[model samples]
Target: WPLSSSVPSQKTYQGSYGFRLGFLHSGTAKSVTCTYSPALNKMFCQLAKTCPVQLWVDSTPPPGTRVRAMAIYKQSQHMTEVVRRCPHHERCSDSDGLAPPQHLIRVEGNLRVEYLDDRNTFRHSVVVPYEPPEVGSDCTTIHYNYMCNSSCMGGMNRRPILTIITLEDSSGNLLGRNSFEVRVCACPGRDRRTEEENLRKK
Candidate 1:
């Protein structure tokens, strides 16, 4: 048994999953796992500079396909906050304010889990870096801005973005065709939510 110090213990506040974010420096913070939302055809996970880390996905997986992801550590930014660089004209102040300086990574591929005694799901994973971390600094950072399409981060060391797609087969069934976009600055959790009600939209 460990002895308690004279100092009184203070209750720690654990915010909602929506507020908790993983940071590369503070260890990996992860977002809740979500199935594809057929109604919206999106599998989005909330991410914030303050929340630490998150896995952004952009793939068109077929039906019956599954994926699993986790947050990985990378770099850190020492800035008090980062300005969201969403190009002008599209800037919305209501958007989550200043981004936190954080270094992070995402794990992609497929997720494999055995639900029933006779049922199994396959998972694949991919890793993408957010920003590079500057060690020993008050604010450490690293990034791989995988958000840019048609262009890699090499040409533009900028903001991060993601896109999701869906694939269907001849009979109009999901065939599970998919692909992911990764950027230059390389580097490297989870729950059962309700099954996707509908993963397709006409």
Candidate 2:
């Protein structure tokens, strides 16, 4: 048993897989772990500055097939609030974002730290070679730094940008595609509600 003057506490993050993020003065402040979204089935696990995304052709593809990556544009901006089912709704701004719902924009450019980082040769909509395991080879892997635009931050800081990674062949056939939503977010526990709560505490 513990002392009576104190109380017990508990803490944990959500999701099956996770990673720590954040930095301070050339250091890191990774107290929280990014997790996957159960609803979207996309990774809500990324940073606003930039995040390293590892993609692969999970299943063995026919020989000579190449990997193609693309950023699905006409990006949508949103905020989490009142109605829970606003994504498929017809422009639900009353309890969501203030701007118009329909728009076209670009989100991946280099990261905010692109000026100093050398390996951040990140770009969307490209093709790369793939070697599958079926032919006594290994998994085809692509290490890319997918960046987000400030407009993605919108009024709320949580935004989802769709990305597609597909397998193509010399015949000009595109198939066996994997879609990803690279979620750009502000610090957790620091949203509009929490910010208000924090201000009241001060």
Candidate 3:
């Protein structure tokens, strides 16, 4: 019953709220909806509600900088109750493990650049790379075979995001902006579980 495991039963609500005197059933709980993204075909039941990345981006570079391109780098794709591990590509300094690919997920969001005061934040499109977490060094791969082996300890996987934005000046010289690194997951509530808490909160 994966779907059953995907939701919080009424009993859990009672347990948390301490409704010992609660004398009734609340059928209105049907309001909780867990829908999947049709585009990525990924489930919505993840930490922070689908675990979308959000960050403040300075679309307008400096006075002399001109836009060249931008891209994001992340670990593996996220899935519910599934483990796909490739734990060797991150030897970044020493001898590398597996032969890795050299492709970056280019920024292709459907939004337009504006005079966004650099204070404006964006809900970055979630992109779980096909490469394993080994491609990334910030987080470890998790194999939750009961003991919970890698990232997502205590309940959330804090995957790292490398946002690289480049610039090309009028002189055809390649200029680089300060790259940004953002953690894709966090715990804002008490005792959040991988999937159980996601369903419970839903």
TM-score, cand. 1 vs. native: 0.17
User: Comparing 2 and 3 by TM-score, which wins?
Assistant: 2
Instruction: State which candidate has the highest TM-score.
Output: 2
Put down candidate 2 lDDT per residue, 26-68, tens digits, no spaces: 2112433243332333443333233334434434456676655
Predict model 1's lDDT versus the native: 0.23
- Provide the overall lDDT of each model, using Cα atoms, as 2-decimal numbers: 0.23, 0.35, 0.24
Task: Give one digit per residue, the lDDT tens place, for model 3 in 94-182.
Answer: 22212121111212221232111111221121121111124434222211001111254322244433333333344424433333332
* Greater-TM-score candidate between 1 and 2: 2
For candidate 1, lDDT tens digit of each residue in 1-202?
A: 1111121111122222111112342211244322222333223233321212332223222334332121111112311122122232124343322221121222223123211110121111222222222454333222212221212232123332222112223232322223222222211112112212222221
Runs in model 3 with CA error above 4 Å?
A: 1-104, 109-161, 170-172, 185-202
Angstrom error of the Cα, residue 200, model 3: value is: 28
| CA RMSD (A), model 1 | 23.1
